[model samples]
Target: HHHMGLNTAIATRVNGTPPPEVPIADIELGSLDFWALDDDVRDGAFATLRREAPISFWPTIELPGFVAGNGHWALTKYDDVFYASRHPDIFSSYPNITINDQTPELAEYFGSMIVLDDPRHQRLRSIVSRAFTPKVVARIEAAVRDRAHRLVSSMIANNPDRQADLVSELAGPLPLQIICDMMGIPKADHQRIFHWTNVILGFGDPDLATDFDEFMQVSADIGAYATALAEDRRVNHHDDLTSSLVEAEVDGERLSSREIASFFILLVVAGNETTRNAITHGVLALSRYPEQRDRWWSDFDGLAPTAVEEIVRWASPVVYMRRTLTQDIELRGTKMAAGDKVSLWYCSANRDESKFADPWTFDLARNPNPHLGFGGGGAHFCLGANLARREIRVAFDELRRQMPDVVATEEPARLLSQFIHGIKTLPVTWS
Candidate 1:
């Protein structure tokens, strides 16, 4: 239900005079202009919020349906986000995970485990958690290693001048193809899956779907394709994730076609998009912080653990996740009612001054990193966190070995969305 165009008429930057005057106080929450603010301004706004009001309320914009209008709390502090995530019983993932509320039918249509609570969430999670089993992870690692090497090699050969948009050439395709390969999706259909995911995740961005009608159509197409594939998998079992998902049963019940489709879409979107951004940003970070890059290259094995953790922290690929309060509660002395919404800003929390010693510094050997690049330690913590980490580490390893001089050639064109810390196009050059 993204950007339901609900707030198109109410595009005013500041609807009311709110307290805690930030330098960019005009960039109100839930506004289109706010989403596209420059990084410094965005970070600056949140830094003021974190200091002046950790649980700041965004006054209503009355866009109510699609544009995140209901006057939610913005949780920018690390401790608050970590707390809210762990207490799911109070802060629930209900009708919708987005700040925008939705009809029950719309929720059911796209309600994967990420948007479900308790028993239902557990049931679905158990069925598909097989994606991370040791056997699956072993295969995942092999695929990741092989693909990372091949992608960099091919990219290097294709760009004899050693210049290319790493997002499209390397970061974008690696995880996209890896997930499809794991699911037994034909390589020929990779771009279709990628296109649908781009539309869904990039819904609010002007470049992706263009209008609400186009967005709905793209969303519908993915559901259709996923359901059809599940049916095919039910009949033809292969040594792939799709076949296993269709056949796997828990306590004598199997997943329905609808359940399969929702889960498939979740995996495709979550698996590819988040990891792609992580890698893209990781490469960019390394390029920007040459000292850290050289230090890591000097001792790849010893530094990889901290290096990967730092990348995830620095990228914080997913900007936020919405949680609805199940009951009235007071956090940090701010009162919230039952049914109220809160946006946990992971990106802001990752760089919280109170948490990290040098929050903005890219330190390859940063130990004890408690960044929530993956969701906070909660029932809804990302299932593919390990796989994403492995993918990022392997991809960077390949670059370190093959193209030690790899660096972003130009400033990236950041995705124009508040949801993802994405780089749409990163011109990178390597030796």
Candidate 2:
């Protein structure tokens, strides 16, 4: 199964050797082979790159149909990635935010604030912020707590076999349910939304699709659903984010039906997937480090806040985000030309030894933790950060109280994708 017709020549080499020196051509950032390996192998590759070629250009690799022209400069160090994110003017996000080029139609259909640069980005962000006010966020937190309680209760009731897949039962469903409720999507449609999100994010995974066409078909269905929902909200408004977006007006300017629809796709994909992966990774990490889990249980109330940060840092749900250079610039003495693609490797940055002491170790009480999991400091920082935090905290609180004996039955089955660091399945049992 191949999405975008990716070149898989490097798959054989990823697990085999480090080469005399890491060659840019051998490094396939988007290849399934790269992600399927053990953590030590993956981290070792990044560690070598950071030490030797912190900023080096690699030739462009194509995904069969989708061509990422002329290669990109990979930034592996913490300082460089942090700088690139803050200086969006120097490294613009306009046109496309990923390594592959999106069709004009596809770009417009999915382009929300994330893919835009200043002026337009600020305008759309300001308008959306109106709907996500402090009062609304507080309401959202309350709703998350209520949903978490019900979800945990139901999971406990239905486990006749004394085992459950956490990904499907807890980690996966909680975020989807909360986001759907916030958007005023009907409860019956939650599963459909979840399916679409998986297809969108999991397009590269063989388990999700055998070809790119399947991914596109699901994406189109989601777009149609969003457009129709926006139309319905226009005539009959409700007290949901969709309704607010439809009615929202900033500086006497409003979002068109298409814009509203695009935002819906963003919320569904970005809002649902990242938090879900973080929660799954957190549980898996705890299972691996029983002492940390015990310490967390000892004083969950005192450690919950910092624990969430450590979880996200460890997970780095979004592996990297791409930016196109707006002007030729010198980075770490390496001259880069305009229109060049630059990827900020958040996974590498979060584990940077210079910035973090014992970067590989998972410490629940890590203080002053400055991780780029949500992205480094900039206007593009996650808008749903507050909501995601509340969700993780509440969900874990309930899990610890209700299923304290829960243990992972096996290692997680990870998603094979360069963009999203995700877990497809996690088996667990509570005695």
Candidate 3:
């Protein structure tokens, strides 16, 4: 159910692998190489697009084994992305939130709540909401802090020179354990869940799992695991998320086993990757600008709220979310037809000068960070927003507290995929 039509998604991953000095006219947003370009270079293109042609269209990719349905309009400016995200009545999440269309099974099965519109979306969201309440998330803070301390401690202690891969050491496992523990998945199987998310969300990156067969199998494995776990939680009692999801009902609406499984998949996929990249980039950002690092470190509690927001704004994890137009509409002088796709460029919006003052500056105390790191405000705004905030805050708190000297000594190896703003690895040493 999950794997069907994913082949098209897998194939779409192989786009242009770069112009040295790119022009706004030549910039291809779909190109993988375009994503790998230096941060300033990519942001430069987006800035040009926002000022020049905010709602421009690009042709579909005709790749091997995949034929795109049609071209898409990119919402580049801060206002356009928010307008589209706000008016989901016109810009729908249904069918697919991807550049290419998927089979009904592929879209609904893997997408679950992420791709649905109300009343289906509302019901599913309400039920899932019970699992992530203020009660549950607040209670989980100790675990968040506990995992952060444990991971960071070992990361510094394990290496004789205090050298470590931040991606593997603290950034990756902090959220991995939290998501797994929330779902009642045992500590032993946490690593497998980590890799499963990496594969599904990682998509085009072959380093994790890009083979069609491999990707499908990973999809199958996680679905099976989710199903199996739900089955156990049905009769078994535990103070875990699976139990809440299995029992959670909103006004006579209950999650089907399949929906529960899909929600688990969504939790790990959406929750895991976004926070992971934020942490990795948070560290990298701190290393690059020691001034901001000192500012936040001096007063972790007082400044964490804004620092976390600034970190997310700077990272802009998960580059874009594709929304399909439900009907023909025109905005800012560009007319789009029903069923046409629109890719909301959050990365571009975060850097929009119109919205953020000195948008490129890494100001830790940046107030009014209406950044789309979590997403533009809508029914689709991130459900795990608080959980992610806690994870990032605690991760950095522990880092600055115990490993104040921890800083990236070199550039990060950015992930190859266009969808996820990820760091594959970063070399760091703490004195």
Candidate 4:
């Protein structure tokens, strides 16, 4: 019952090459399902991608008709993705931050921080970047660590001898608290801020969306709140990031109210959700691959530094970031025209075999690990990457130290968007 013919079929389609003459009996390509498959089927996809196709066109049912939709291609290979991200002049992160899809609000906010061409991107980034510098952000590390510890401890305390959903108890609160702390927002306001973050970024998940009638209402509420905060900071300066943003100036030009609101939205959404998913996904990865976990724990001292890179690579949370080709370009032997949008699929690229030896396996010591998780190259290489790294590393360190026996009580349900690939609900239990 070896699937020799199926393996050949996948190889021919994916790689434009023939399968191995001597079939590796254990490896079966037909068993793989790249989308919405059970674990068995998904693992088959991973195995086949590792063995044969390093890069291929994977169009999803959700977003169909590449030409009709707006000339987009998904780059799965690591090299291709890295090349696309780094070479922003060629593949610009403009017009839309999440692939080619754009709403009026998103399009207006696109050029703010996450998606902008140079000069404009550089000018705006310089002002906002002041608040996120290592000196500024690193000062909050102790606070982040403290929050993670308290959150994890509370999870354990609540269910002394039973199970708890780590995502709900630990992952969710850690980021929210850290971000609120950074923004100088009160803990009481965390719920509203968290909801707004979801509203803006959760467009991918229909269930998370408030009814259309209420959607604009919530957006206005959040915008008014942020604008009020900016105004307050301008009148009475403070020592927090929000005040710094209000006070920030470039060549004597102050940020507009709209710019400040947009920045506020990006800060909260990107800061909270992506890092939260990284922590949840990192733990799940380690738990599934115990050997890797054991290896990391054994070499905790030496492996600590590279742990952040490994987690980011493994999680690859900000899934596929998009770019528009300003001019006709060629990538991975495919020709694309000007104004075309190409999605650099980091999730697929992180596991590309051409650039990684044993790309499927988790390796903490992976060097030259040019991952698109933070985006390798581009005008907009994640402004908060350092903060994100610190957050995930701290969460993992605390979890391993305190809740080593924690195990998943329920399977994680992945968020249904191609934009930010993550788990909406990761149900779990531990004793």
Candidate 2 lDDT tens digits, 383-409: 888778878998899889998756777
What lDDT score belongs to each candidate, Candidate 1 first? 0.79, 0.80, 0.80, 0.68
Q: On a 0 to 1 TM-score scale, where does candidate 2 land against the true structure?
A: 0.91
The per-residue C-alpha lDDT of model 1 at residue 155 equals 86
Q: What's the lDDT for candidate 2?
A: 0.80
| Superposition TM-score, candidate 1 onto the true structure | 0.91
Estimate the TM-score of every prediction. 0.91, 0.91, 0.91, 0.83
Off by over 4 Å in 1: 1-24, 59-69, 249-252
In candidate 3, which residue pairs get closer than 3 Å at backbone N, Cα or C atoms, i.e. clash? none
Model 1: clashing residue pairs? none
lDDT of 3 by residue, 52-104 (tens): 88888876543223347777999988888888889989999976776767664
Candidate 4 structure quality by residue, lDDT tens digits, 1-431: 34322121111112112223222344332121233444334334544554454343333223321112454665656777778777878887777755445556543333366666777778777766766787877888889889889988888788865566776788878888887777878788998888877766665356566354455556667767778988898899877778887887755788787677777777887877898888887777765555566777777767866777877887888867777888897765677788877777677677665776665556677787876788766577788888887788788778778866455545677765556656777655554
